[PDB]
Design a protein around this ligand. Structure first.
Ligand SMILES: *C(=O)/C=C/N[C@@H](C(=O)O)C(C)(C)S(=O)O
Ligand SMILES: *C(=O)/C=C/N[C@@H](C(=O)O)C(C)(C)S(=O)O
Ligand SMILES: CC1(C)[C@H](C(=O)O)N2C(=O)C[C@H]2S1(=O)=O
Ligand SMILES: CC1(C)[C@H](C(=O)O)N2C(=O)C[C@H]2S1(=O)=O
Lengths: 265, 265, 265, 265
């Protein structure tokens, strides 16, 4: 039984593990705490980019956004370099996915517009994909430091996996805009030690990671078998019992991904 | 419950699959047709080098062996290049392991001495290691085209795994000679699409492959988890029912190796 | 006579190329704009690690350095992942060389101490090696955006080649610390399409790349012939005339490296 | 210029070097002893295969050829294994190119028919390509042991290069047969340490090697620049005066190929 290995990995790493792989036409669905709530962390930046692409034409990517040093509040290796020149919506998209730039996500949230800096509009976009569970309430970096048990800024492996399936595999975006999202996730630089490290090399892997306090470590991914069969793999975890400053364990997400690959083989 | 995937792979590839992983101190042993006989093929070249290392001092590796054009009876990518210069016993070991050189193996068997060109002496070495099942009767390339049902030149995944464990992990060789065999298998060039391809990249893999007629494809390996735990993986397969000219399916060994990695994670 | 191909490559790529290979005991020195100033870019991280290694004992590499999210000011593929756990001086060295981590370089400069966050101390280390040309004035990522004609954060291929020669080939470091620098540059991950791509596969290549605005592309390397003769190859280039957003051309450095290989053969 | 490096390599490796690169539309021709005669050695098997394709229909490749153990005269790693089942002309082609099989070459020469075991027919095919210099007089392995100064079984780097140019790049064969020849040379197993070893990895290389007595070592190849520009590189060498049992030096051909790569960069 596979759920025995997941609970074994939970005990070995002193964490709570959540795994969901939507069932394909050939294989069954993998579930472990799939309907339990985990914090979004940086993984929300993937459907955030799709939200801007969905509501705006392709020419919107050339719009230049100027910002001040007071807007830099989270880890922003790209936004800190263009404070004087500004960045276009396209560059904010590239930074929000590949480098998980915090303020780039906050600026994209503002581009969604609406109350709460665009968090209300963002959750509304998740509702259009049929997801009535996830919700974003804060901006960066507050959405990462919510206490355990709090439902604000949380999703579930079941909910986030099906969202990612419609965006990459489904037609929730036209193919011209769908290709831009996939290329950003394919050249991601922040998830080399997670789902990518758990699957063999001849498996294609695109992903968007997430890390927060309380030992939070997420990774939502779309993998391709060596023959070309696509799957959706949502792996999230936290270590609330270890405290606020608990260290996240990337090895947990990598070990769990290898268990998923063994079943899909 | 892992053997359900193995039987699914046998039906998917039209082949007979044999898998054995010796049990460690923490995990149990993986077995699938583990006590059924498969053809040695070139996998016998790994304990053959260990046999030469065991019976001779380290200075014996500098002995130069000369051979004629009539000795090149099989694919010999390294021995074919030094017919004028000759090759030392050390170079014959390197070619027999890394490039699976046939003529290098035949000369090493002759260096063992005894009846049948040293095939009796080689089997005698396996008997001293506790292997009471395997047997080598022919040389290259006759040992690769034995008819199905014939027990000549055959081993079992159970037997070959335990031999490899004693040679690499156990103390069947002194550490100075143990390091030579491990380094040769570490730089193998013929098995990139088998056990190496089924395991994630952060796993260290040393191996010696084997391929013959009747769709035969073997790969004996020693893998190391990212934390440093060693395991022994013996995967063998044939497609005898498909005839003498049956094509081997390397994807079968890679898929089976991925299933093993999920259990060992 | 080799400089005819170099000027032909400059015309083909619309760039300014700088090449220098210090003369060995058998061959003469290769020079092309060798005494012209090019921007340091990330090449300064190689002698920066050597500077830290020189001034501290080997046990100093275990000192844990803590940093905040505001320190992540540039592309930092390793520093972004250990903001909560912190990184040791040894890990900062590995990240600054192999992954060209920006924040790791800034922290190592702070460990050097002195004015301007340690840029003055770094320039002082180059002066002790006989380099009276180079100079580091800013930190990451400002040192890459300097305008053309400005001497700040610039070296010359003549100067950087002799610095790299003393660190790797000379005894400017004790062998225990010298071996650490060589192994880190040998496992570099950012320069597979530059000098490494210009040399045949049987040539060992260690290097540290550098890329910035104005189409800047540098690569300082130490290569070994298949027989074991070491050489030092310093290749730098920019396209300042193309503007700030000029695209760097890695093919120029790979082609220039191939021309040098023909001479050293 | 460049011919000084060739004379430097000749004096260093104690050999006689012959290099020819047919001029392209952009580059000039490389010549060094290009019109001097070197022994064909195994390089004649490349235009030999093209000869069978040219005068025979595609169905001729399925014709089964039977042979006895008395026909195995030269190094035949593939012909030694099929002395009972026999091999088709197509299998004889694959063995003659990729593994430089001796008996495979003699059987194809006999398939050409005519006087002298088909050597007269083979030279006649070379004459139709405009080559009035080369000539084949013996079979394997006699064609390799001719004394120096003897014009039997010899070609020139100028003559063999232009033949290879029409066979691979030109339309001396229809594309249906031209693709078969190119794929066989691309999967060659006997020339990894010659022209292939002298060019960088991002250069594609197909070749057919040749080795004989008197330290003879040839390699005719077709290389492709990383952008896709094809060239023809003919490198031949012997070491007359060193005796019949003189050792061939593969490093000479690899070093000379690096000099060619430096010019074409
Ligand atoms: C090891 O098992 C192989 C020797 N050669 C094989 C190969 O695939 O190269 C064969 C099957 C061609 S063989 O020599 O019977
Ligand atoms: C080495 O010091 C530089 C790296 N510079 C660039 C990079 O490739 O990461 C940037 C993006 C930091 S830059 O010059 O704005
Ligand atoms: C919230 C973060 C600043 C930022 C983030 O997820 O936005 N994280 C990393 O790069 C790890 C976690 S974090 O440091 O908590
Ligand atoms: C048979 C060869 C192709 C070639 C030959 O004789 O044609 N030989 C040498 O010079 C040694 C053997 S070989 O290289 O295998």
């Amino acid at each position: 039984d596979l759920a025995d290995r997941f609970a074994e990995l939970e005990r070995r790493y002193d964490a709570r593990l959540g795994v969901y792989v939507p069932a394909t036409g050939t294989t069954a669905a993998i579930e472990y705490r799939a309907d339990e709530r985990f914090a979004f962390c940086s993984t929300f930046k993937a459907p955030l980019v799709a939200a801007v692409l969905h509501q705006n034409p392709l020419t919107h990517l050339d719009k230049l956004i100027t910002y001040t040093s007071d807007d830099i509040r989270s880890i922003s290796p790209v936004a800190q370099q263009h404070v004087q020149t500004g960045m276009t919506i396209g560059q904010l998209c590239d930074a929000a996915i590949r480098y998980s730039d915090g303020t780039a996500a906050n600026l994209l949230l503002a581009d969604l517009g609406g109350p709460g800096g665009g968090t209300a509009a963002f959750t509304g976009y998740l509702r259009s994909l049929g997801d009535t569970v996830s919700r974003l309430d804060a901006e960066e970096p507050e959405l990462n430091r919510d206490p355990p048990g709090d439902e604000r800024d949380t999703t579930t492996p079941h909910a986030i996996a099906l969202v990612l399936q419609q965006l990459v595999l489904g037609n929730a975006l036209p193919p011209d805009k769908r290709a831009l999202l996939t290329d950003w996730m394919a050249r991601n630089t922040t998830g080399a030690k997670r789902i990518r490290a758990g699957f063999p090399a001849d498996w294609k892997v695109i992903d968007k990671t997430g890390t927060g306090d309380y030992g939070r470590a997420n990774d939502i991914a779309v993998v391709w078998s060596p023959t070309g069969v696509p799957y959706v793999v949502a792996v999230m975890s936290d270590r609330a019992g270890g405290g606020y400053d608990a260290e996240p364990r990337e090895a947990l997400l990598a070990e769990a991904a290898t268990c998923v690959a063994g079943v899909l083989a």
